[PDB]
Design a protein around this ligand. Sequence first.
Ligand SMILES: Cc1ncc(C[n+]2csc(CCOP(=O)(O)O)c2C)c(N)n1
Ligand SMILES: [Mg+2]
Length: 226
Amino acid sequence: HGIRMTRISREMMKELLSVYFIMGSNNTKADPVTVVQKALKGGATLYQFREKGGDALTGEARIKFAEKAQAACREAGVPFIVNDDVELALNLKADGIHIGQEDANAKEVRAAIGDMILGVAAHTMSEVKQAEEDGADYVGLGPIYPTETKKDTRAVQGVSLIEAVRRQGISIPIVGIGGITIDNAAPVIQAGADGVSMISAISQAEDPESAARKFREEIQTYKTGR
Ligand SMILES: Cc1ncc(C[n+]2csc(CCOP(=O)(O)O)c2C)c(N)n1
Ligand SMILES: [Mg+2]
């Protein structure tokens, strides 16, 4: 449960991606930390701290919120991943960092974080292959379904890229993202993904704990069945 002195195994990474909850203070009307605690109690297997955009906390307020979210993750025994902010990830001794195509180059990031978990968002086959070559531990593929949680998102692709990646014999850990709900997660796993990631399906649920628990149960069933 400490800092990694060796890169994560693919088997372990795939287990962590099962129910990957992502959240920032501006993704819910409830108390931010409380929602994160409920998501973890319910069954989320991985959590990503993503605090950006308008209304998002900044400065010291953002750092203190990150510390509380990381504490919640430690209590639940779930890894804490930071989005974009490499310096914050190192400063908090986070378990990982997630970056996109317009963020810091993956090769640069991999060198700066040692053996920490590294996730990269990809939308094309070329980007997936480049991410693997750069040292990524997993790729986030989407948007699978329509979503407006994230402002400028690329064209909806369903599970097409997930399928294409597996058909080429690429076994890198994959997590699907974008408009995923309790009702539409099955196809994502069936296509070859190792889990599903979401924001609103849990953060804006009238019952975050039950939603996370439903996800955890469903994904387990889907993985055993494919
Ligand atoms: C693992 C990973 N893959 C992709 C992204 C970028 N991203 C693409 S769609 C989306 C919103 C989903 O919200 P909703 O579930 O409410 O549609 C985000 C944050 C990321 N941060 N982490
Ligand atoms: Mg980014």
